[PDB]
Amino acid sequence: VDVTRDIVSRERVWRTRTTILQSTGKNFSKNIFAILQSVKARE
Amino acid sequence: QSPNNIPALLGKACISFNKKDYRGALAYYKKALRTNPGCPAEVRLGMGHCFVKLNKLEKARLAFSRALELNSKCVGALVGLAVLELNNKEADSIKNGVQLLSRAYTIDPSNPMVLNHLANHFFFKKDYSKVQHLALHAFHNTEVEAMQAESCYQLARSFHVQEDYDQAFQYYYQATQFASSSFVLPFFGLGQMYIYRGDKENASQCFEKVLKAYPNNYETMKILGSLYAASEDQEKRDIAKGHLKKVTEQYPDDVEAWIELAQILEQTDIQGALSAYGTATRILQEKVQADVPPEILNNVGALHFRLGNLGEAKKYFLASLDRAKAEAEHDEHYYNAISVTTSYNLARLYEAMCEFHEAEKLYKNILREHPNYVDCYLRLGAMARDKGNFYEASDWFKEALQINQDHPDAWSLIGNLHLAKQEWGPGQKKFERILKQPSTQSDTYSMLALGNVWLQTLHQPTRDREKEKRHQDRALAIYKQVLRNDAKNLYAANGIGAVLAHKGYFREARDVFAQVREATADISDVWLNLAHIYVEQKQYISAVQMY
Amino acid sequence: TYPFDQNRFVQYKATSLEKQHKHDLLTEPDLGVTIDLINPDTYRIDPNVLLDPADEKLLEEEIQ
């Protein structure tokens, strides 16, 4: 109905699900994938 | 061959002038007035125009003056002094308008300079008729780009205040396209014209050159109101921050400046948004004692919801609903819908009070009047989930999919219910496949849920049977997938460290958990998983404290 | 969000940014003079030469 688009337009979402999982700092995964490959070097 | 007369070398100096070398111009131009050949064309005119360059104005005035004494009929001296006194408009208005301009119009009514200047004067004198009489001729009679750029620009500002914006848009574009490096008002005209007709994508691009020109208070608000910065888009958001702290210290009758301050601050620090709303509450009271619109007050209560200021957040929602009631006739603005979402926020607040009774009341008030809404339909379900799973919790959740099967949040919450039934472990492939339709994909939350239901399979005596080894490597594959699509997820890295710790690499685990440890300490899982490593080195005196 | 007016129009106006601009004189690209060695049929170099006080203070580049 008009109420649905009427509300979901005017509000805002600053807090979702997905960026909870993502960290507020910058933690890249190269270090993570480097040790991922390093344990594979033990394999 | 023959340096026996000066206009042989003065033609060098006009070339030098047009190469922007006014020094090389005036070097030969000194040789003009020492000799002064037969020149009714006033070598002193170009003298003054070089003195117009690089602000040698007092020499320019004297050159145009002696040009007028040799011949008052000549146009260039009078228009030169006309532009020279275009600096002061509130001071010496009349002599600019009539003596400096209308006399040039008299001695030549076809001079596109004086036509352009009477045009912009008539604009400021609010004579919007004869500006369009003579700006067309000011366009046709000139043939150089910047002049006809200014002609199109002035016809554009004429039809802009006359709201003939379709034609004036074309004039603005032609004004930009003729001579662009001259000056930036045609760029501003196009950018604000892109607010017409929804053309605002080019407004940002065109207004960027205004900041490339030079920053001003003006050129903040255009990019601030024209906020393509929605979220995680710093190319419009960092510049928004810069303009907002370009205007916050200022006050060109700042009213909404704090509103679009805090409007990006809700992603950022909340206290900045609080402060913006604080003086924004005030700023609506002094020009007229006007009550704050309830959208502001609801949002500041929403801020205090994630703060400790829960009680006055409730007071904000109450007075928000009252001000929406004070919006008695505003179904255009739909104060009723604003009250709907305000009541949603207040019921969420009553949940924070653990006043689930009144939360039920507000929720059923909204759903009995807007049953199409889903979030109220499931927060009720979440409330009964706090009581338990097979309640009408689970059924509100399933009917939330019945009203909206496209809804990924509720659909995730369906399997979230099934997390309680871990015996429904391998069955969760199906109930977390339903919206693995690629419209919903990518869903990091759900695929990490797949990883988690896949890891709870572990610590079984079947690893030696290669079954949990395959499960470990399958969870590893999920974690590699979420690794590549997101380096900065932390629950992922927790999962990698957990599965490799189940692989017996505990020296290889405290490091990867250390990363998410500085990333955020406020993950309950990593506290446990680190101390498991500690007791695996028998480091109890490092472990139980963190327990 | 706030229901902002679409600011498709100027009333402040930009006139602070407008009259600060000093406007070029490019009526004739060789700077408003016909460049000719034939139309000087006359010459002040003959007795007597003429040079106004304004003309000497324009014969200097920058001496103030």
Coordinates of all heavy atoms in Angstrom, one line a residue, chain A residues 7 14 18 21-25 27-29, chain B residues 266-267 337 445 487-492 519, unseen atoms left out:
Chain A
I7 N 6.5 5.0 4.2 CA 7.4 4.9 5.3 C 8.8 4.5 4.9 O 9.8 5.2 5.4
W14 N 20.8 3.1 9.2 CA 22.3 3.3 9.3 C 22.9 2.0 9.9 O 24.1 1.9 10.0
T18 N 24.7 -6.8 7.8 CA 25.9 -7.3 7.2 C 27.1 -6.5 7.7 O 28.2 -7.1 7.8
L21 N 28.9 -7.8 10.9 CA 29.9 -8.8 10.6 C 31.2 -8.2 10.2 O 32.3 -8.6 10.7
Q22 N 31.2 -7.3 9.3 CA 32.3 -6.5 8.9 C 32.8 -5.6 10.1 O 32.0 -5.1 10.8
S23 N 34.1 -5.5 10.2 CA 34.6 -4.8 11.3 C 34.8 -3.3 11.1 O 35.1 -2.9 9.9
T24 N 34.6 -2.5 12.1 CA 34.7 -1.0 12.0 C 36.1 -0.5 11.7 O 36.3 0.6 11.1
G25 N 37.1 -1.3 12.1 CA 38.5 -1.0 11.7 C 38.8 -1.5 10.3 O 37.9 -1.9 9.6
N27 N 40.7 -4.5 9.1 CA 41.4 -5.8 9.2 C 41.3 -6.5 7.9 O 40.3 -7.2 7.5
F28 N 42.4 -6.4 7.1 CA 42.4 -7.1 5.8 C 42.6 -8.6 6.0 O 42.9 -9.0 7.2
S29 N 42.6 -9.4 5.0 CA 42.7 -10.8 5.1 C 43.9 -11.4 4.4 O 44.1 -12.6 4.3
Chain B
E266 N 24.9 10.1 11.5 CA 24.2 8.9 12.0 C 25.0 7.6 11.7 O 25.0 6.7 12.5
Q267 N 25.7 7.6 10.6 CA 26.7 6.5 10.4 C 27.9 6.7 11.4 O 28.4 5.7 11.9
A337 N 2.1 8.4 8.9 CA 3.1 7.4 8.7 C 4.3 7.7 9.6 O 5.0 6.7 10.0
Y445 N 25.4 -12.8 5.9 CA 24.9 -13.3 7.2 C 24.4 -14.8 7.1 O 24.8 -15.6 7.9
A487 N 37.1 -9.0 3.1 CA 38.3 -9.2 4.0 C 38.0 -8.7 5.4 O 38.7 -9.2 6.3
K488 N 37.0 -7.8 5.6 CA 36.9 -7.2 6.9 C 35.8 -7.8 7.8 O 35.5 -7.2 8.8
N489 N 35.2 -8.9 7.4 CA 34.3 -9.6 8.3 C 35.1 -10.2 9.4 O 36.3 -10.7 9.1
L490 N 34.6 -10.3 10.6 CA 35.4 -10.8 11.7 C 34.8 -12.1 12.2 O 35.6 -13.0 12.6
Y491 N 33.5 -12.3 12.0 CA 33.0 -13.7 12.3 C 33.5 -14.7 11.4 O 33.7 -15.9 11.8
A492 N 33.8 -14.3 10.2 CA 34.5 -15.2 9.3 C 35.8 -15.7 9.9 O 36.0 -16.9 10.2
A519 N 40.2 -5.8 16.5 CA 39.2 -5.3 15.7 C 38.0 -4.9 16.5 O 37.5 -3.8 16.4

